[PDB]
Structures are given as structure tokens and as C-alpha cells.
Amino acid sequence: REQARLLKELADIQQLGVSAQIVGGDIHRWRGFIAGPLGTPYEGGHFTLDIVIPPDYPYNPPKMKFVTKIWHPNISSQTGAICLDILKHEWSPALTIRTALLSIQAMLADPVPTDPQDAEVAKMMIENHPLFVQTAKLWTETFAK
Amino acid sequence: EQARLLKELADIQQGVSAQIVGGDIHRWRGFIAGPLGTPYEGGHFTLDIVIPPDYPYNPPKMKFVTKIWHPNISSQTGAICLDILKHEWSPALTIRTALLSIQAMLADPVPTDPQDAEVAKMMIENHPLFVQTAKLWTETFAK
């Protein structure tokens, strides 16, 4: 019943940007894939996420982090860690892993210096925004391509 | 706040639909087609939608205006009790997804946790009477 939900999520993700695979035969461990949105420094990039689905999913949210190196104020440049409202206080069992991936993809299209996971990336984006964009595009070409 | 509702309303209009009732953008009329292969097939159901001051943090309130015979909807008042509109609400959901969820509930009634005891009793003990009745009410109120 827990497995049935996770399998159908996987199927709908494929039937529908974003995608996902299970890892090592475990339906509680997935890899997410997200395309850099068009008109961002991430355009043309392909970003891999690690997805740990907790035992009491869907009541508890999945844990997601970037595996692919990315330069973004809301993603740790060092560890890939993120802090998304939808994976936190805005989570509900009515949502899906897909809506989380889409929401991460939207976050790539709308960087927020103001409330950041990476201090240094945020610092640069304030001091020198055109450099931030140059860095993000080079990181995309280098690590996501 | 207004911009969120105006965007949701547009997207909905661009199955299920809604429209503003008069001039209050916090009050909508919702519309749901009865699903195929169910007693509600061919029906058009109207809902009342009250969007509270503090939406999207507080869920919409919804009830059926159209009379309907369904164990999870009051036959008398049209009251519903949908998880998505309660403990499963999130600002990341939309009014459209609540409409879609209510539509799903039409395709899959749950007599074992009911909103109408009289309807759930009939569904349990006299299922063909339930289907017959639910279809008669679709024909009477929803067509």
C-alpha cells in the first residue's frame, strides 16, 4: 500500500522537465533529474538529485539534495543541501515527489539571495550579480553537461 | 493575495471549473462533472467555495450546492469532509486540486467512514438500491 503509492508515483513521473529512477532495487531510494530552466544560468544543464524516501512517507516528506554541483544561493555549493518550504512546513501527503522536483526546478528559475543555504553564493550575488550569473553558467557547463 | 486567486481562477478556466459568484473574488461557484462509469455520470454538480481571508494558509471551504446521494456528502446539506481541505491542506495545493480530489471521491465512495449515515447504510446493506438512488438524484438534481 506504501509500495503501491511509490510505484504509481514513479509510473506517473515517466508517463508525464523532470524524471526519476529508483536506486539499487530500493523503492525508498531514488535519483531525481531536473533540466535547468530556459533563460537561467542553468539552461541546458542536467541536475541529478539524491532522494531518500522515509518509512512513513507520504506523511513525512522525502529528503532531497543535489548530487550535481550547482552555484545557487538556495543550494549549498559544497554539499547540495536545500531548504524547500514544500519539503518542510508546506509538505502534505496530497503532494508528490514530482511536485517537489517541479518546485526545485522553479527555485532554479527564481534565486533568492535574501534567505540562502550558501552564504558565499548569496554574498557574491549581492556584491556582483553579473559574476554570480557567470559562475552559475560556467558551473552548469562544467558539471551539469 | 488577490494576485494568487486571480491567477488560480484564470488557470482553472483555461472535468472541473469555477467562476466568481458576484463581485467577491473570495466567493466562487465550483463545477464538477460526474465521473464516467459511476451513478453520477452525466451529472453537473455545483459547489459553493468560500476562500478565507488568509488563503493560501487556510483552506477553502467547499460544499455541494447540487443535491447528491453519496456516503461522503450530506444528502441534506451538501457538507463534505475532505482530507485535502483539512489536515492535508498545504499552501502548495490549489483550489483546482481540491476540486479534482472531490471529483475522485465521486468515483470512489467510502461507506466505512461516512458523512451521511443513512446513505452509507444503504450503500452497505442494499448496494443496488444505493446505485439506483444515486442515479435518480443525478437525473433529478444534476441534469
- Residue pointed to by grid coordinates 443535491: B67
Q: At what angle do helices B127-141 and B117-125 cross, to 10 degrees?
A: 130
Name the catalytic one among B6, B81, B107, B124: B81
Q: Do A95 and B93 touch (CB under 8 A)?
A: yes
DSSP letter for B131, please.
H
Beta-carbon contacts of residue A90 (< 8 Å; ≥ 6 apart):
B90, B91, B92
For residue A10, the tally of other CB atoms under 10 A from its CB is 18
Q: Do B88 and A86 touch (CB under 8 A)?
A: no
Cβ distance A71 to A77 under 8 Å? yes
Tell how strand A26-35 and strand A63-66 pair up: unpaired
Q: How far apart are the first and last CA of chain B?
A: 36
How far is Cα B93 from Cα A93, in angstroms, rounded to an integer? Answer: 11
**Is A96's Cβ below 8 Å from some Cβ in B?**
no
Q: How many CB pairs under 8 A join A and B?
A: 26
Q: Which of B82, B83, B84, B88 is the best mutation test for A, with the most CBs of A within 10 A? A: B88
Cβ distance B45 to B142 under 8 Å? yes
Cβ distance B68 to B75 under 8 Å? yes
- Residue pointed to by grid coordinates 531518500: A52
Q: Cis before residue B56, ω within 30 degrees of 0? A: yes
| Least Cα separation, residue B93 to chain A (angstroms) | 8
Rounded-to-5 percentages of helix, strand, coil across chain B = 35, 20, 45
Q: Do A91 and B90 touch (CB under 8 A)?
A: yes
Structural domains of chain A ordered from first start: 1-145 (3.10.110.10)
**Is B84's Cβ below 8 Å from some Cβ in A?**
yes
How far is Cα A97 from Cα A34, in angstroms, rounded to an integer? Answer: 12
Alpha helices in chain A (DSSP H): 2-15, 97-109, 119-127, 129-143
Beta-carbon contacts of residue A54 (< 8 Å; ≥ 6 apart):
A28, A60, A61, A62, A63
Contacts of A86 in chain B (CB under 8 A): 90, 92
How far is Cα B25 from Cα B49, in angstroms, rounded to an integer? Answer: 10
Tell how strand A26-35 and strand B61-64 pair up: unpaired
DSSP letter for A25, please.
T
PDB resolution in Å:
2.1
Q: Which residues of B52-67 are buried (b: 16+ CB within 10 A; e: fewer)?
A: eeebbeebbebebebb
Q: Which of B4, B86, B90 is the best mutation test for A, with the most CBs of A within 10 A? A: B90
Catalytic site includes residue B81: yes
Q: Is A8 exposed, middle or buried (0-12, 13-18, 19+ CB in 10 A)?
A: exposed
